[PDB]
Design an enzyme around this catalytic site. Structure first.
Site, short mmCIF file in Angstrom:
data_model
loop_
_atom_site.label_atom_id
_atom_site.label_comp_id
_atom_site.label_asym_id
_atom_site.label_seq_id
_atom_site.Cartn_x
_atom_site.Cartn_y
_atom_site.Cartn_z
N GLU A 125 -23.83 7.47 35.84
CA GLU A 125 -23.39 8.00 37.13
C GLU A 125 -24.65 8.59 37.76
O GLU A 125 -24.97 9.76 37.57
CB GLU A 125 -22.29 9.02 36.91
CG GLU A 125 -21.03 8.37 36.37
CD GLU A 125 -20.00 9.36 35.89
OE1 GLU A 125 -20.30 10.57 35.89
OE2 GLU A 125 -18.88 8.93 35.53
N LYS A 130 -25.04 28.76 15.14
CA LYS A 130 -25.75 28.04 16.17
C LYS A 130 -26.69 29.04 16.80
O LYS A 130 -26.52 30.26 16.65
CB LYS A 130 -24.84 27.50 17.28
CG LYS A 130 -23.95 26.33 16.98
CD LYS A 130 -23.18 25.95 18.23
CE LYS A 130 -22.25 24.79 17.96
NZ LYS A 130 -23.02 23.57 17.62
N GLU A 186 0.82 -1.21 0.00
CA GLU A 186 0.00 0.00 0.00
C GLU A 186 0.86 1.26 0.00
O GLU A 186 0.47 2.27 -0.60
CB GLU A 186 -1.00 -0.04 1.16
CG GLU A 186 -0.47 0.07 2.56
CD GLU A 186 -0.69 1.43 3.18
OE1 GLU A 186 -1.25 2.31 2.50
OE2 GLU A 186 -0.30 1.61 4.36
#
Lengths: 949, 939
Positions: free
Chosen positions: B295, B853, B65
């Site tokens: 948790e 955003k 490769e």
């Protein structure tokens, strides 16, 4: 009657006036005063002939004769020539009338003892008592009766004169009207003036004089002046009109009266006719009783009555009376719920009588209060030479020539038989009741004859009366404790090697800061103490400020019942809230300052609250807050004045609403958190030592760290508040509409500068040059309103100029009148000469320059520097040296940019206080309205703070 | 080989059109068609790894490769393919693994033919030349020389070698120079001819994964690759796979102590487990990874934090071959954990027994199924490069419909597999690896290839039987169904409120509410901003510490509750301010008011524990004790924010006052703190105004209900003013550091408040001296790495600041700054119009950004809330003003304000020295008598 006998007189060593008493053979008591350091020399004459010594046909004759004996000599028959001759020689004469004495008193310029006294001696040879003199003077005596109609003290005084036995010669009249003095005698053919000459000659000229001369020549030269000069008095031996019985002759005992006064008051007056104690002046049991009546101590009567809420105030004690009898009076205030319980209050009076009747007489109370009288009369301050001679001539009739000074203000012996005698007198048998309350309207028929008050027997039936008689028992009442604490050691302490004219920083910590000087000038046992409390939480909220005020309120109210006797020993104090913290000053003698002060610090250091005391103080100040919604407009203006020129200010609305949640656990939990970490600064001045002051300082800081663990502050949490800058040319304003008053107020403010040496003289001298012309020009000349004021408004170390004027005017109109006066001053700059300058700046100079006359004055001034942190101790000499350094062109330069309307440094503010419904004006720039002060002050620059000297 | 079977694939946000197909010569092809891309992309994965190498030569498929890079018969040049990617912005990359060799690249816009021409004849003619090989052997040498110290490959090869050493899992993947050309030629093996055998038979058959992210068409791409890349012809070479798990009972119940390069401490627990790749329906190994990292109440790590031994611990399924898979557990270590190892693993067993007690769970399955439904449903996007190589990785293990809908949906529940891995998760099946630095000289069993050291160290039987026998139940109970899973995914269309900026829909003296619906993004989520003002922040330093530790332990208390919010995709913030409190709530619009009201109710009526108090108290006491050792430029910025406020409690005052912290003191302070305060609110996203009014009213109602909050007077809504200067003076002082031997310095310049003039003054003059500062100061002068300049925005007041840390003479360093002042001063008039104009365009697009955003626009809106100005188009107006500046304008801005004789010279410096005008003796006595600035009028 040329006789003289005198010697050195024990003269209370503080005083320097040299004395000599003697009695002349024609019945004249003579006191010779020699004060070679006095400005005004003086003389006075008292004759034991009173307004009860009047003829039975003519009332108020002796008052008319002490008016009329001034007028007329064979040397000068003119009316005021004696009076004008003392207007030449600075003499202010006056005379008065009592039940048994008629007294004359005057002064003279410096040394004029031959002249004025010869003009006064000529009265004895030739009094005139003219037609027109008499006939206008009787109108003046009738006006004296007329002005005593509505005067409640002399109205009730004559009601005392008239409501005894109306047959007893006590019932004679004192003042005299037109009619009884001069209109009924001559219509009965009795000559008024022949009564005047008969009265003068037989009664006045005979005997019973008490003369005193305050000279400064010597003892002996005025002695053989006056004993030679006043042998002209020739004896005729009038007997002394004395009374062999009290006028309350079984008609006036166990009897009630209800009187309508002019003033809206509520009072009860209880009288005990009691035997003589003028002979008993040595022990003076009656004033000892008056010491015991109104004393506030453990188990006191006033403590109990305030604890029951019935009595606002009271006073009782010996009432002086005639020669044979005396009286014993009680003068009390009443509450509304005391008004239903007055009879029960009298029962409590009998309870206190039983308290005095249980323990009998006491020796340490008498002996120590005797010692207090001894020392305090020994260390009495001073006296005005006018009034002194009238006083000592008043009591000179009753005492031998060495007893004339320690006359009754000094006590020789203990007389438990006399104290038991007056204790045995205090019984329900001896009671006379007179109620003075305004709400007796329509109910009081028996009207006074002369003045016209109205009263009634109007008795409550005998149930209550005999219930007073039988019920002689004591309850809570206890012995008052004693606070003597060495008033002997009063001597002065000479200044140390540290010789400063100002209180120096003798102790500085991050906890403390201590300034101290001992008394240089005044040479006194006393000392004065000023004290700073800084706190962050005083200025945070309406809530916490309410918590501060209620704390200090109940605090100072709590230890007051102890404090009464201690302050009665001569030790005064003060608690006062500030935005900083609380303010403490304690002023008095060296007697108990560490001890009492220690008890104060311990007391407020660990302090507790009662619930209903908290509730009554809560309600009381809750009502005290919303008071400002009705106040005066000038007051409203001063309130907004001090509102706007601080950092924040919490309103009565917000203070009143902030009491909605104040609980005793809320406040009382807050207080040790409040007292957690503070700083204290102290000013000490007086008769003490420096190192002893350091120990007192260590005492107090130790005490504070002991109780509540006081920690020192940081100077970054020790702050002061700033003052707001202006747009440098803008004049901004707003309005407030009062509700009550139809008058409008307005006040104008100027931000000049910090107190530099230039600016103080600028603002004070300019203030004084606008003090007299403005008052002469606006209130005198323009007559704007009764409230007219000019002068300074100084805050945050920044000067200012304020004007407090309430009137019924448009405020912008009134501003135009202000600006007209500003133009008037503007022209009056150049209209000022050199002389109008110099006299005025010298007026400011003497205005500024003065030494104090009390240690408290300079302590308040130095403390005024300390609260401003300035300490520039010789600002007076420096600023006066600047004051002499001003010019005219100085005040032009002060005018142009600071004072003018087009001025580029014009920092001018005004505020309108409107009414309830509300010759030259220049072109003012437009002001703004100021709706929201917060949004106003939100973006504005701020002043610096002062760099401390 | 024109065979194709596919269609468009069910995705919705993304527009990349997808078709998978298999070619008749054994070529599986996935076509990505996104005609909206600027750069088209392509990727090829070969599922042949170093596990197919001969046992004597390492990295042979790796070397092939590598060698398949160089050389086509069309272009035999070395980097000519790489040059075609250097022209057209193409970034190729390749790697070698046990089972994969993957390629991915892109091109400028349309360039699919070029890459084809320089890539297709790799399958026809891989050249394997003189120069290609003889340089690539050095490339393999460098490849192992950079991969020798790589702890990922070191620890992973340590996993490869500490299994069966006979199994080809114990082979080496990368290969150095030595195994490439020293070991084969001394064995006489020609590498090249093996490469030709391996490519001709082996790399030609199958297990290549082609994919192209193109924008051409559905069919252009199709005959593009299908026609010319049909050059692959099947040979039916078998799949290099492992039929067994290589951890073959030699290393079970065995410990290992590993010497790392990095100073790290970790403990590793390993389970080889059979294939559940067929069962992606329940995905039991990742379902276990879900059960490890919870948790919550009654969770294991909740008690482990309560014990203080374990900071964190990740677990779950690790992939392996088709035949085997792994299960790895990676924990954090404390020191005392090393002595309590047995009890830690006991707690692990406790939780295993809890899973063995509670059995399988379906609502956990259905719940995480809903999480996969929602999270894959509204998954946003991905980087187009690398993604194609990833799904080409997924092409080998999934059919062309399962390569994209990969694992993101859960079909069926498998409790028997849960029991199966429960039989796997047993103390019999444990491998233990300890990673610690202090085991040097202590671990003699050395790794073969890389050379780290470990030890077999069988565990004595007291610990073994304690691990086996003690599998018990104690306290632990799995947390129950979360109350908030959202179903509101219906974005609300924009209504009558068509303003592009938030309007004050409600303001009282109690509350303030600003609101806007989301115009840009149209998301089911909503994000929330809240200011809670109180004057009680500056009561004491101790009360400010109270505020701090209160909100700190407060939020930390509800953090144990907040883990469900972290599990649901709902983020938040609580943070104190010097002014007040800050509340952020982010997530979906469904169940934020009810959950938020539970937050309100909980912090309103809140309790205090003693030892949590004590710990956080001591910890922040330590952090304050540690704030004497911090960065001198950061220490200088603390002096910057110290001096230029109205009043601030110092850190010594914060430090010392903590001797006074009792629990009744604060616990008494809390209802006092909650009695009178201010409320401000920003609500933004796809919601309405009326529902915002009702939700906000509910919230403040709850507040007055619990703690009887009353308003603050607007005079008791103050801000801190800023200190007036003499406006031409330059004053300075110094502070000597303790720890760092570098000196810091900051020079300060306030012009004015943010007017439209001053913002472009500040920004433009600051950035125009930024790039010549990079030219001369940082590059030429080489003072230190901390060299920074720019604006100071504080209290609605602009300012200009300079951050330079180095141990220099401070006044000489000031002279260097003065040299840069003269530099820029003459450089104003030596500037052409071009630098001016391109720079103001730089500033322009620097300032002009569209949002990316809801967070972005909410940060800008909150940036208007913090100055209370609400100047919503300050941006556009100031930009319109920005080109309105001239060269002579900035001459005036320098001369009038900034020059040495300037009357607006607001110049002040603060020196922070190394570890060893007028002077400033007392900052308190400095600030005692000084004027103060006004504040800003809100527009």
């Amino acid at each position: 009657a040329i006789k003289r006998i005198g010697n050195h007189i024990t003269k209370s060593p503080e005083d320097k006036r040299e004395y000599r008493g003697l009695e002349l053979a024609n019945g004249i008591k003579v006191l010779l005063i020699s004060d070679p350091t006095t400005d005004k020399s003086s003389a006075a004459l008292d004759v034991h002939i009173g307004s009860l010594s009047d003829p039975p046909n003519i009332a108020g004759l002796s008052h008319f004769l002490e008016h009329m004996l001034f007028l007329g000599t064979k040397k000068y028959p003119k009316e005021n020539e004696y009076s004008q001759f003392l207007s030449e020689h600075a003499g202010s004469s006056n005379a008065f009338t009592s039940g048994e004495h008629t007294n004359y008193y005057f002064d003279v310029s410096h040394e004029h003892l031959e002249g004025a006294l010869d003009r006064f001696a000529q009265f004895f040879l030739s009094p005139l008592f003219d037609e027109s003199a008499k006939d206008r003077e009787v109108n003046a005596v009738d006006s004296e009766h007329e002005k005593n109609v509505m005067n409640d003290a002399w109205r009730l005084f004559q009601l005392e004169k008239a409501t005894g036995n109306p047959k007893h010669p006590f019932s004679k009249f004192g003042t005299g009207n037109k009619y009884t003095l001069e209109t009924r005698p001559n219509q009965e053919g009795i000559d008024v003036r022949q009564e005047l000459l008969k009265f003068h000659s037989a009664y006045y000229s005979s005997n019973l004089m008490a003369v005193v001369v305050l000279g400064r020549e010597s003892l002996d030269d005025l002695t053989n002046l006056v004993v030679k000069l006043f042998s002209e008095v020739e004896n005729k031996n009038v007997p002394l009109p004395e009374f062999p019985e009290h006028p309350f002759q079984e008609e006036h005992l166990k009897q009630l009266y209800k009187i309508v006064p002019i003033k809206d008051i509520r009072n009860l007056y209880v009288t005990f006719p009691i035997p003589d104690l003028q002979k008993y002046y040595k022990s003076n049991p009656g004033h000892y009783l008056g010491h015991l009546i109104g004393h506030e101590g453990p188990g006191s009567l006033l403590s109990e009555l305030k604890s029951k809420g019935w009595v606002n105030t009271l006073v009782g004690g010996q009432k002086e009376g005639a020669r044979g009898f005396m009286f014993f009076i009680i003068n009390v205030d009443l509450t509304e719920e005391g008004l239903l319980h007055v009879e029960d209050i009298i029962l409590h009076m009998f309870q206190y009588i039983q308290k005095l009747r249980a323990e009998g007489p006491q020796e340490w109370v008498f002996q120590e209060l005797k010692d207090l009288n001894a020392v305090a009369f020994r260390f009495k301050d001073k006296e005005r030479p006018r009034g002194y001679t009238s006083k000592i001539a008043g009591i000179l009739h009753y005492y031998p020539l060495e007893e004339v000074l320690t006359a009754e203000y000094l006590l020789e012996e203990f007389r438990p038989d006399l104290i038991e005698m007056v204790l045995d007198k205090l019984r329900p048998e001896n009671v006379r009741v007179a109620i003075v309350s305004k709400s007796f309207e329509g109910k009081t028929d028996r009207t006074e004859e002369w003045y016209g008050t109205q009263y009634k027997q109007e008795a409550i039936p005998d149930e209550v009366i005999k219930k007073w008689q039988n019920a002689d028992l004591n309850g809570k009442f206890k012995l008052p404790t004693k606070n003597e604490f060495i008033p002997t050691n009063f001597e002065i302490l000479p200044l140390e090697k540290e010789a400063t004219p100002y209180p120096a920083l003798i102790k500085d910590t991050a906890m403390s800061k201590l300034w101290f000087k001992q008394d240089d000038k005044f040479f006194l046992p006393k000392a004065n103490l000023n004290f700073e409390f800084f706190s962050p939480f005083a200025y945070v909220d309406p809530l916490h400020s309410n918590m501060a005020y209620l704390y200090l309120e109940l605090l100072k109210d709590s230890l007051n019942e102890y404090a009464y006797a201690a302050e009665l020993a001569g030790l005064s104090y003060d608690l006062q809230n500030t935005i900083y913290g609380m303010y403490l000053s304690v002023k008095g003698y060296n007697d108990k300052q560490p001890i009492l002060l220690k008890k104060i610090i311990e007391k407020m250091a660990t302090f507790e609250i009662d619930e209903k005391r908290f509730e009554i103080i809560k309600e009381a100040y809750m009502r005290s807050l919303n008071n400002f919604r009705a106040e005066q407009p000038h007051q409203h203006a001063m309130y907004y004045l001090r509102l706007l020129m601080t950092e924040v200010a919490w309103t009565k609305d917000e203070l009143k609403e902030a009491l909605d949640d104040v609980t005793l656990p809320r406040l009382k939990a807050f207080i040790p958190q409040l007292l957690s970490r503070l700083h204290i600064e102290a000013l000490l001045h007086g008769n003490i030592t420096k190192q002893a002051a350091l120990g007192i300082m260590q005492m107090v800081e130790d005490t504070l760290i002991e109780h509540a663990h006081t920690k020192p502050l940081l100077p970054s949490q020790l702050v002061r508040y700033r003052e707001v800058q202006l747009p440098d040319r803008g004049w901004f304003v707003y309005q407030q509409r009062n509700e009550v008053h139809n008058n409008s107020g307005i006040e104008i403010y100027y931000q000049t500068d910090m107190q530099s040496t230039s600016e103080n003289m600028f603002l004070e001298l300019f203030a004084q040059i606008i003090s007299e012309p403005a008052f002469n020009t606006l209130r005198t000349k323009e007559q704007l309103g009764y409230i007219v004021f000019s002068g300074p408004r100084r805050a945050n170390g920044i000067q200012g100029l304020r004007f407090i004027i309430q009137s019924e005017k448009p405020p912008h109109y009134l501003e135009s009148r202000v600006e007209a006066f500003l133009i008037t001053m503007e022209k009056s700059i150049e209209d000022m000469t050199e002389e109008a300058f110099q006299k005025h700046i010298q007026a400011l100079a003497i205005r500024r320059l003065d030494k104090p006359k009390k240690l408290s004055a300079e302590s308040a001034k130095y403390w005024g520097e300390i609260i401003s942190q300035q300490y520039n101790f010789d600002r007076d000499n420096t600023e006066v040296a600047y004051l002499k350094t001003l010019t005219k062109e100085d005040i032009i330069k002060f005018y142009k940019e600071m004072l003018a309307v087009d001025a580029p440094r014009r920092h001018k503010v005004s505020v309108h206080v409107l009414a309830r419904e509300m010759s030259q004006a220049p072109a003012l720039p437009q002001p703004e309205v100021i709706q929201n002060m917060t949004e106003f002050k939100r973006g504005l620059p701020l002043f610096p703070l002062v760099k401390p000297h």
